Amino acid sequence: MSDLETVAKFLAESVIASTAKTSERNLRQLETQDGFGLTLLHVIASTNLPLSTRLAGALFFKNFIKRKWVDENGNHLLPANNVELIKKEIVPLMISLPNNLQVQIGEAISSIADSDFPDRWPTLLSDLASRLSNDDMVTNKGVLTVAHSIFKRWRPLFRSDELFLEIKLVLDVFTAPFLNLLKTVDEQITANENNKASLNILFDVLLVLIKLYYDFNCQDIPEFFEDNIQVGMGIFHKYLSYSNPLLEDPDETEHASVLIKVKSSIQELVQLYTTRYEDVFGPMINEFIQITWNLLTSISNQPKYDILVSKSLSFLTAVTRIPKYFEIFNNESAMNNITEQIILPNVTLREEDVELFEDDPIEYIRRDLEGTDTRRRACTDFLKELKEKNEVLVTNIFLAHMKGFVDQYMSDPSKNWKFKDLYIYLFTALAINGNITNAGVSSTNNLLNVVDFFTKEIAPDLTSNNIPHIILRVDAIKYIYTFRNQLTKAQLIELMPILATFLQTDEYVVYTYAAITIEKILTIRESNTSPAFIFHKEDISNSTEILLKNLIALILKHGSSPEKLAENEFLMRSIFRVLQTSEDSIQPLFPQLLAQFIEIVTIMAKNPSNPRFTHYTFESIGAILNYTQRQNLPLLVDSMMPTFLTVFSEDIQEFIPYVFQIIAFVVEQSATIPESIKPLAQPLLAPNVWELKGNIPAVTRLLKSFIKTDSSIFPDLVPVLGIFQRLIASKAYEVHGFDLLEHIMLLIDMNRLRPYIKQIAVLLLQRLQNSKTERYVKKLTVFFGLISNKLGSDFLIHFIDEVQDGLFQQIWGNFIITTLPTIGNLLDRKIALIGVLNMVINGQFFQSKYPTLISSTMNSIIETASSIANLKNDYVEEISTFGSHFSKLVSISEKPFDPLPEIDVNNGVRLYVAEALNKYNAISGNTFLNTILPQLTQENQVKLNQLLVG
Amino acid sequence: KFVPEYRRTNELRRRRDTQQVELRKAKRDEALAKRRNFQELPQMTQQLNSDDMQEQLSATVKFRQILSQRPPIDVVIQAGVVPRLVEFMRENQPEMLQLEAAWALTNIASGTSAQTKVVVDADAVPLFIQLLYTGSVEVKEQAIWALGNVAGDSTDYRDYVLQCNAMEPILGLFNSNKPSLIRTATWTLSNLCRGKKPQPDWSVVSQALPTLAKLIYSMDTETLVDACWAISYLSDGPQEAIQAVIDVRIPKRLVELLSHESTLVQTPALRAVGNIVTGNDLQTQVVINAGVLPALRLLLSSPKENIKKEACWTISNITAGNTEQIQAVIDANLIPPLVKLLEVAEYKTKKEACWAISNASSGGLQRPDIIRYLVSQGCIKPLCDLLEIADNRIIEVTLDALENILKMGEADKEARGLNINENADFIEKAGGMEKIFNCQQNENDKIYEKAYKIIETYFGEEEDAV
Amino acid sequence: PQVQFKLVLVGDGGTGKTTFVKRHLTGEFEKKYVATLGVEVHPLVFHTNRGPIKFNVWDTAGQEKFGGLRDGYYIQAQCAIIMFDVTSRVTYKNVPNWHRDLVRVCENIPIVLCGNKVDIKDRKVKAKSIVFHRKKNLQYYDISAKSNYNFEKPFLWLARKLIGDPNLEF
Ligand SMILES: Nc1nc2c(ncn2[C@@H]2O[C@H](COP(=O)(O)OP(=O)(O)OP(=O)(O)O)[C@@H](O)[C@H]2O)c(=O)[nH]1
Ligand SMILES: [Mg+2]
């Protein structure tokens, strides 16, 4: 009967599946009653209700605050009376609840504070701080957790006066109790040395105190913490070394405990102090170094210490970057003791990796290729940081240890094979200056010889009949991959038949890394200033067929199920690269290769699984078509189109944007539309083809290719204009609409366009009033320039005026000349600028009909021609839905249409404009410049003289 | 969801103190405001009230002596002699009596604010000012010292002194030959110029700039210290205040003083020069033409950390200027030292070298050879390293530098037909790609969005090499 | 289905939680995005070598405005799946928020972190970035509701954890 009893009833029902949704609808109805907020608080406090019902009430109250406490402007939405009573009850209520309920009320307080603190809740800070006591560490944890939730909001903020005022307010209340409480927790931890339960509680409080210590120091080191630094950091200094058998258990290797987290939080704070407040922290840094050195010395290799180890190494890395503190271990003794104690024990190959090698080879390869927070990586980055500060010392110290690793291996290669993996790894890390990139390694350590190390240590392991462990075979191949830029062409050529032979083995990682290394060798450029690759077609032609034959056999090796066939994308990436390098070397085999790729497409269509495999399959098809003689395209086309039609009819959306690109390329390269492709033209225009974002770029390209190659394939232009309308009306697809329109206007005879030219202009300009974007107006301006440059100034005027006489001059003076100087894309800027100039110097009708437009047009021209790289350079988060992704095929990519190729966008534009203006002035009997100069702004009269006298 | 605006996240030139609120412990590099000029009380009070001139003098001399070199200020006040001392400064009193009375009052005003209040409420200030007109050189020296302590006590007494028209007679003192008079008057003058909120009446204290232009041509260290501090206060202002300093042709000698032997001189001189380059490009070029860039190069190696910091801040407001001014910085060989500080200096200094390099890269978008040279000098690695430790504002500034560097590399790739963006490869080589990528974990949305754009624009598996 | 478990499925809007459940329920792949309103509870039955196991999947709403009871759904949950979309970096950035709210209600339940949509080429959240599961001792899986990659791994791990039998098989 009661309203409290009724609220509790449906709070309870909300935990049960059959009533989860109805209970919420009932509660939302009960929620309209005034005081529902306070009714929830009374339910939460009712110890006679089951805990789950009270928890449902605490969660509902919390989310009630988040929904209905304030509107977007910060106006309280509850009656002013309820608001103040909530703020008065909530803190005392929080204290009285057990943990599971207490934390949710703490979060509701934090949510209220998000909007009301500090201006509209002045009592909160005193309210919270007054609940801390020396004898109740449970209540302390709860209160401190609320404080941390509020104060940690400072961490992502930019400094400001308003923020520092807020921080000052908090410090005045908390500094004394915070330090005192911190000074009390350390005392009770020692007194309770053998009380497990009380220890876990005390360290829970310590963890939040450490996090709060960070909150108070994340913007600047406040005066209080500078003055009291010795006691504060002194305490943390202590617990970095603390060890208690009760708070540990060797039987757990993954789950980091509160003690582990406390030391990690301490190391976070120590690195903050070391990197931001070294001036204040300096005197104490040496103590933390020594304790960090001892901490890493006696740390178990169990993963549960991984984070602590990396946070310690990042601290030591920050210390390595401070010269004063790097010198304490910038000598052979210390550097050698770091090596033996810190780095080497963590760089050895751990068997948690060897198992990934055997059980999930493809994943091992992907992670090896791209790489964090493993001890190996954390320690190797530390090793790099040291090398950067003293290369000679670090290198020689490791060359000494590696010398002994060689002897350990040569003595018993079968058992000590892991030692050879070690010094290959170490040698690589020491030899590379910085990190390897997608382009390889660009420079190496002058104290090491990668070619010598290759000849002596790597090459023998490639061809040795027996290998102590296939991991060393992989290490050898990976060395070639890593140092490919450091080997000569002749050395690489000698390796090509060896790597190719690996493609006939059964070891997953060996033949995959071999394929990867071949592919990367074929991507090495001769230099960055020309496109030529080191490997030309004559360097691969004699092995192209056998490489492709073996790569295909590896793809098919484990069965032709869609998921297994497509498993290894590196095989198909290598096929693509081989094809690209070989060009027309094996043209006679193109029909058979293409038939094999088409069969792969057919199998994968049952379940597309690997998008990278799929992508490079179609890249490979694109490469074949790119190197096929044009008169042989129809025969290849005919062998593909049955499968492509099935891709449409079965709606295999993963392949549809690739098929559209391939077909478009074929049409672009043919003098006529192949007969098997003609039936697609008019179905292409159905609106349902243009619904998915992932297909639009591809079907736009296909439609453009039909228009260019043979626009008579479209007997009716109405549905073509219907596509243009659909694209141009859309903010998302407007760019494709302009791209289509350019093809329409420039490539279809005007006799055909005549009945539609007014409608085209109306559609194009409707966006200006309804829903114009900045990109739209920029693209419209470029489009005007393109029309002017090609069809002429008179055409453009009568194209726009056909919509409404007078519209040309209105759009020109409002949109075109105002927008021209803001166009940042360099090719678009040239087209627009030259097109606008063309109106003045090659538009006698423009001059005679709109004489008063010339001055403002010239101001825009001069400003645009006399101006920057600061402008937005391109025309570039959201929910992915099925089919929303488009992937461009580089094998058949097209460069943008430049109608003004004799004018480089870099410096030719400015020179062109100046020469065109001088010429026009000369043709005018030297009256244009003199007549227009006084009509320009002061600023542009100067810029113009710099152009002409330039 | 509503939050206070300063808890939301959704011209490169920087003025002295755009944000005054501080959490850090205040560290004073400024000269102490007040200065002191190094029981038979009943009997002295009887002589001071006596009608005899020689009895008055002997009493005044005694009160001055006990107040010299600690001094029982509150005890002298309790004797009720302060108004009598003030009477001894009146225009119709003997010269030596005026001298002693003014000296004694100077030291009473040298103590607490309550003790200064005693002298001020006794109407001493109009008489000090008068003694600056009528006194001998010895009298003028005592009166100007007294006015320094009043002015140095608070902005209110500073303004009261100025409201009494003290500036006109004070500015007449600087024709004296006595180095001790010039020293004291320069310190008092710096006290009249000191104080930010409220600032002194500009129409009055800007009348001192011609005199300050002369004073910085002193070779007395103490005089130069307080003269440069005075100029540093007056130059802390908008373009109008900077222009008044330029008009009196102070910058040339101010720049010369950056190379003074004493860091007590370099500090205020550098502060004043820093203030001047917060205006516009034209005002900044006046300082460049005075030779500030070679002088700044040496200060980047100064043993005083705060000198290095202020030198970087000054350079950063120069590289906030135009292409030619950025090139001038490069031409003065200032980048190698900046890059060095960017990797080894204390954070507050390192942070300022970041602003300087970042601002230069913003103008380097118009002269790509600027960014080439920056990259050539190895700035990429220090910038990337700074991403891991810096406050959120400096993260944003550092990402903007890296974005400019990437834009230039991309524009260069397209202009020259290069295969890859060379600066993107340098950044990845230096380990910077991962450190930019990790900025996407920041809850600050501006930082996240910038890092995301950089990663997706320049490192997003763009293309297969063809 | 007499062995029953309350499983809460949470994650940002559009990450594929409903598509994933419906694929398990009927085998159909849903192409359209129809945001879930609060929760929909779906029973999933697996026939194992230890008998039939039933998961009552509380498929919750990821969009805040449709969140319904939000973490009110987590009360007495015995396991959970946190989902994100490997093509949307922001959905992984929000994983700690979902995990924090879960463990505040359910201290010690087994939780599987699922990175969905690995069938899409433009993957933004690489394995390198995916480290949250080691910091909080969650099991992680790449999955694809579209291609059925690792389709059953989340429920299999939870079932083994819940029954305490590493040899349980579906
Ligand atoms: N390509 C691809 N798309 C998927 C996959 N899984 C889901 N989707 C698509 O992603 C979109 C999101 O679908 P939903 O399952 O309804 O998203 P949700 O997580 O339930 O979102 P909310 O209910 O609002 O919390 C739909 O368009 C799905 O078709 C996948 O594995 N691969
Ligand atoms: Mg859903």
What's the sign of the alpha-carbon dihedral A749, A755, A761, A767?
negative
Element (H, E) at A604: helix A590-604
* Residues whose CB falls within 8 Å of the CB of residue C25, separated by 6 or more in sequence, listed in order: C42, C44
Q: For C39, which of A20, A256, A883 is closest by C-beta distance?
A: A20
Closest CA to A836 of A912, A735, A766, A728: A912
Closest CA to C48 of C13, C3, C8: C3
The CA distance from C122 to B169, in Å, is 78
The CA distance from A673 to A651, in Å, is 24
Element (H, E) at A76: none
Cα distances (angstroms) measured from residue A198 to each of A181, A189, A704, B119: 16, 8, 75, 64
B214, with CB counted inside 10 A (0-12, 13-18, 19+), is: middle
For A534-543, which contacts have Cβ atoms below 8 Å and span 24 or more sequence positions?
A: A534/A489, A534/A492, A535/A489, A535/A492, A535/A581, A536/A581, A537/A581, A537/A582, A537/A583, A537/A584, A537/A585, A539/A493, A539/A581, A540/A496, A540/A578, A540/A581, A540/A582, A540/A585, A541/A582, A541/A585, A541/A586, A543/A496, A543/A497, A543/A500
Q: For residues A481 and A522, is the Cβ–Cβ distance under 8 A?
A: no
Tokens of A584: 């027309």
> How many whole angstroms from C64 Cα to the centroid of ligand 2?
12
For A256-263, which contacts have Cβ atoms below 8 Å and span 24 or more sequence positions?
A: A256/A304, A256/A305, A256/A307, A256/A308, A256/C135, A257/A304, A258/A200, A258/A203, A258/A204, A258/A207, A259/A203, A260/A304, A260/A305, A260/A307, A260/A308, A261/A207, A262/A203, A262/A206, A262/A207, A262/A210, A263/A239, A263/A295, A263/A308
The CA distance from B302 to A493, in Å, is 56
Q: For residues B343 and B389, is the Cβ–Cβ distance under 8 A?
A: no
Element (H, E) at C141: strand C139-142
At position A155, the amino acid (one-letter code) is: R
CB contact, 8 Å: B87 with chain A?
no
Q: For A24, which of C33, C38, C149 is closest by C-beta distance?
A: C38
Tokens of A869: 């790289």
State the DSSP string of A761-779: HHHHHHHHHHS--HHHHHH
What residue owns the CA closest to ligand 1's atom 12? C14
Closest CA to A777 of A811, A809, A815, A741: A815
Preferred mutation among B18, B19, B384, B419 to probe A, highest tally of A CBs within 10 A: B419
The CA distance from A492 to A487, in Å, is 7
A532 phi/psi in degrees, rounded to 5 = -60, 140
The CA distance from C28 to C145, in Å, is 10
Closest CA to A670 of A645, A635, A623: A635
Q: For residues C98 and C61, is the Cβ–Cβ distance under 8 A?
A: no
CB contact, 8 Å: B58 with chain A?
no
> How many whole angstroms from C79 Cα to the centroid of ligand 2?
18
3-state secondary structure of C40: strand
Q: For C69, which of A24, A611, A880 is closest by C-beta distance?
A: A24
Number of H helices, E strands in chain C: 5, 6
Beta bridge partners of C42: C57
Closest CA to B302 of B356, B266, B329: B266
The CA distance from A144 to A400, in Å, is 52
Q: B407, A227: Cβ pair inside 8 Å?
A: no
Q: Give the N- to C-terminal CA distance of chain A in Å, as an integer.
A: 92
The order of strands in the sheet holding C3-11 is C39-48, C51-60, C3-11, C79-85, C111-116, C139-142
> How many whole angstroms from C47 Cα to the centroid of ligand 2?
25
Q: Does residue C18 line the site of ligand 1, with CB under 6 A?
A: yes
* Residues whose CB falls within 8 Å of the CB of residue B11, separated by 6 or more in sequence, listed in order: B320
Element (H, E) at C41: strand C39-48
Q: For residues C49 and C168, is the Cβ–Cβ distance under 8 A?
A: yes
Residues of B in contact with A372 (CB under 8 A): 434
3-state secondary structure of B178: coil
Tokens of A521: 């060798």
Q: For residues B383 and B342, is the Cβ–Cβ distance under 8 A?
A: yes
CA dihedral B418, B424, B430, B433 (to 10 degrees): -150
For residue A949, the distance in angstroms to the closest alpha carbon of chain B comes to 21
For residue B441, the distance in angstroms to the closest alpha carbon of chain C comes to 7
Element (H, E) at C142: strand C139-142
Q: For residues A661 and A887, is the Cβ–Cβ distance under 8 A?
A: no
Tokens of C2: 């007499």
> How many whole angstroms from C38 Cα to the centroid of ligand 2?
9
User: Which residues are close to ligand 2, an ion, with C-beta < 5 A?
Assistant: C 17-18, 36
Closest CA to A338 of A404, A294, A375: A294
Q: B366, A576: Cβ pair inside 8 Å?
A: no
The CA distance from B98 to B133, in Å, is 13
3-state secondary structure of B314: helix
> A1-950, what's its fold?
Leucine-rich Repeat Variant (1.25.10)
Residues of A in contact with B7 (CB under 8 A): 153, 157, 163
Element (H, E) at A602: helix A590-604
Residue in the structure block whose two tokens are 């739209």: A776
At position A556, the amino acid (one-letter code) is: L
> C1-170, what's its fold?
Rossmann fold (3.40.50)
CATH code, B363: 1.25.10.10
- Is C91 labelled a binding residue? no
Locate the domains of chain A by residue range: 1-950
The CA distance from A641 to A655, in Å, is 13
CB contact, 8 Å: A869 with chain B?
yes
The CA distance from A434 to A721, in Å, is 55
Closest CA to B120 of B166, B68, B71, B64: B166
| Ordered alpha helix ranges (H), B68-136 | 73-78, 82-87, 95-108, 113-121, 125-134
3-state secondary structure of C140: strand
Residue in the structure block whose two tokens are 């005003």: B109
Which structural technique was applied? X-ray
Q: B365, A870: Cβ pair inside 8 Å?
A: yes
Cα distances (angstroms) measured from residue A578 to each of A206, A492, A575, B420: 61, 15, 5, 21
Residues of B in contact with A70 (CB under 8 A): 2
| Ordered alpha helix ranges (H), A522-589 | 544-555, 562-565, 569-582
| Deposited resolution, Å | 2.0
Tokens of A140: 């302390």
For residue A373, the distance in angstroms to the closest alpha carbon of chain C comes to 9
What's the sign of the alpha-carbon dihedral A360, A362, A364, A370?
negative
Q: For residues A279 and A226, is the Cβ–Cβ distance under 8 A?
A: no
Give the single-character DSSP code of B441: G
The CA distance from B99 to B143, in Å, is 8
- Where residue B378 falls (left for φ over 0; alpha for ψ -120 to 50; beta otherwise) is left
The CA distance from B285 to B328, in Å, is 10
Name the pairing type of β-strands C39-48 and C51-60.
antiparallel
At position A11, the amino acid (one-letter code) is: L
Q: For residues A443 and A407, is the Cβ–Cβ distance under 8 A?
A: no
Beta bridge partners of B189: none
The CA distance from A828 to B148, in Å, is 67
Q: Does residue A882 line the site of ligand 1, with CB under 6 A?
A: yes
What's the sign of the alpha-carbon dihedral A803, A806, A808, A814?
negative
Cα distances (angstroms) measured from residue A561 to each of A373, A506, A604, B87, B326: 36, 19, 8, 112, 63
For B388, the domain range is 2-464
For C153-158, which contacts have Cβ atoms below 8 Å and span 24 or more sequence positions?
A: C153/C112, C154/C81, C154/C112, C154/C114, C155/C24, C155/C44, C155/C46, C155/C55, C157/C110, C157/C112, C158/C5, C158/C7, C158/C55, C158/C79, C158/C81, C158/C110, C158/C112
At position A839, the amino acid (one-letter code) is: M
- Where residue A596 falls (left for φ over 0; alpha for ψ -120 to 50; beta otherwise) is alpha
What's the sign of the alpha-carbon dihedral A729, A732, A738, A740?
negative
Tokens of B190: 């710096």
CA dihedral A743, A749, A752, A754 (to 10 degrees): 90
Closest CA to A167 of A111, A225, A207: A225
Burial pattern A37-70, b for ≥16 Cβ within 10 A else e, equals: bbbbbbbbbeeebeebbbbbbbbbbbbbbbbebb
Name the pairing type of β-strands C51-60 and C3-11.
parallel
- Is C31 labelled a binding residue? yes
Name the pairing type of β-strands C79-85 and C51-60.
unpaired
B378 phi/psi in degrees, rounded to 5 = 85, 35
> How many whole angstroms from B406 Cα to the centroid of ligand 1?
35
Residues of B in contact with A877 (CB under 8 A): 452
The CA distance from A107 to A61, in Å, is 10
Tokens of A945: 């003289």
Q: For residues C147 and C36, is the Cβ–Cβ distance under 8 A?
A: no
Q: Domain count of chain B? A: 1
The CA distance from B451 to B403, in Å, is 9
Burial pattern B148-185, b for ≥16 Cβ within 10 A else e, equals: bbbbbbeeebbbbbbebebbebbbebbeeeeeebbbbb
Q: For residues A650 and A605, is the Cβ–Cβ distance under 8 A?
A: yes
Closest CA to A883 of A723, A663, A656, A680: A656
A83 phi/psi in degrees, rounded to 5 = -55, -50
